[PDB]
């Protein structure tokens, strides 16, 4: 069974990005969508859309990269470097606004799901309401 | 009893000038003036590339070896600076300068720091009026540092304070050579001093 989808989705991404793929499907789930939504907004991905495969709902996720470098290994820089799951099943992690983290001394983001909704840290800090950390990303 | 002994020598061990004797350490005799090689037999022989530590240690001494203070006292001051606001390394200096014994020298009532220190344990100095015989005393900003209305008429003092006539004094300081008066204006900010030292090492030295 799919132990933890989210972990799974972030992984699917973590993976495809490394091989430098263009798109990358993922089993559809509101929440999963809600996450992506932020990724898109924060500018980590060329966005994404709903699709169908075998007849079941997936989420084409269009990946984003840098520009060809020079010299050895002309592989682009990953728009998305780091990107890990935090609160996994059997080890849920919860923070109260006062506890939300400084993802990458500023340059990163942290996706919290809150009673107000899924949202970036600063977003949270803004509405002032912590919740469940979901994934240091940067 | 802070050190006490072959001094114009530490000038030598540090390979630079600290001016411990005030005068003389100015004429053609501070030894560094022809004989800059440190003390001991192995003084003139070729030097060996020093260890990062080596340096660290040498620097702390140099600076602490100037104000002639105990590693103990010295340490507590730095530890105090660490604990405070502002570029710690600097602040340390501030505290260091506020040592009255220093100030009485900064205002040249005495030839050097040593001699200055003595004019204090002997009550010749004052702050806001009341007498004070504590070198370690820390002059606040706005205190007047004069001489003993009684002790004023001293050779050593007249001699020194007189030779201070028309002499320029530190910017964070000022004085009136007339009545032996003086005054602490502001904590000399890093730039104000010309200490031959990279105190940013004294910082490093106290870590390891």
């Amino acid at each position: 069974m799919l132990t933890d989808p989210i972990a799974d989705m972030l992984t699917r991404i973590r993976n495809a990005t490394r091989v430098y793929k263009e798109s990358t499907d993922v089993p559809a789930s509101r929440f999963k969508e809600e996450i992506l939504r932020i990724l898109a907004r924060e500018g980590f991905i060329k966005g994404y859309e709903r699709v169908d495969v075998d007849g079941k709902p997936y989420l084409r996720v269009y990946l984003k990269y840098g520009p060809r470098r020079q010299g050895p290994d002309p592989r682009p820089e990953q728009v998305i470097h780091h990107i890990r799951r935090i609160s996994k099943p059997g080890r849920r992690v919860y923070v109260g606004v006062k506890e939300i983290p400084r993802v990458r001394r500023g340059l990163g983001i942290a996706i919290l799901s809150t009673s107000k909704g899924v949202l970036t840290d600063r977003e949270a800090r803004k509405l002032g309401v912590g919740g469940e950390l979901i994934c240091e990303v940067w | 009893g802070r050190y006490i002994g072959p001094v114009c020598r530490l000038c030598r061990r540090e390979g630079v000038k600290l001016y411990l004797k005030g005068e003389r350490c100015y004429s053609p005799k501070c030894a560094m003036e022809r004989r800059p090689y440190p003390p001991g037999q192995h003084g003139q022989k070729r030097a060996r590339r020093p260890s990062d530590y080596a340096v660290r240690l040498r620097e702390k001494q140099k600076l602490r070896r100037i104000y002639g203070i105990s590693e103990r006292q010295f340490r507590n001051l730095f530890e105090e600076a660490s604990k405070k606001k502002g570029v710690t390394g600097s602040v340390f200096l501030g505290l260091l300068e506020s040592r009255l014994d220093n100030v009485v020298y900064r205002l040249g009532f005495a030839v050097s720091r040593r001699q200055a220190r003595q004019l204090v344990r002997h009550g010749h100095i004052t702050v806001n009026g009341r007498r004070v015989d504590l070198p370690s005393y820390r002059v606040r900003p706005g205190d007047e540092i004069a001489v003993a209305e009684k002790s004023r008429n001293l050779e050593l003092i007249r001699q020194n304070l007189e030779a201070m006539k028309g002499r320029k004094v530190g910017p964070w300081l000022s004085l009136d050579v007339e009545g032996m008066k003086g005054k602490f204006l502001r904590l000399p900010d890093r730039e104000d001093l010309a200490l031959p030292v990279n105190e940013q090492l004294v910082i490093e030295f106290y870590s390891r």
Partner: protein, 104 residues
């Protein structure tokens, strides 16, 4: 104010009393994971009213006996073994795991 707990009625034998299993739940002090954990309270039921396997509210109360400081506030939900079962079985798991072993 007087504490209040909820749980099922795992034991009935005692006359005028009921064992009330009360599952607590929380975050591990050091490792995080919310470990579930529990405790059995003997509620004082004066009319042998409540039956086995009924969720109830338990109220903190002035002593009825040694090992008995609670009265049954009210009935939350009626009937529902399973919970009792899980309980009865665990009591069974204990079987002989000492010289021979439990059973399965």
């Amino acid at each position: 104010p007087k504490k209040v707990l909820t749980g099922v009625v795992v034991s009935d034998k005692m006359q005028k009393t009921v064992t009330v299993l009360v599952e607590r739940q929380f975050p591990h002090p050091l490792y995080g994971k919310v470990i579930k954990r529990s405790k059995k309270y003997l509620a004082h039921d004066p009319e042998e009213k409540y039956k086995l396997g009924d969720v109830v509210e338990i109220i903190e109360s002035r002593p009825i006996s040694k090992r008995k400081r609670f009265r049954v506030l009210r009935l939350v939900e009626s009937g529902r073994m399973d919970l009792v079962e899980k309980y009865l079985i665990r009591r069974q798991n204990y079987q002989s795991l000492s010289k021979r072993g439990g059973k399965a």
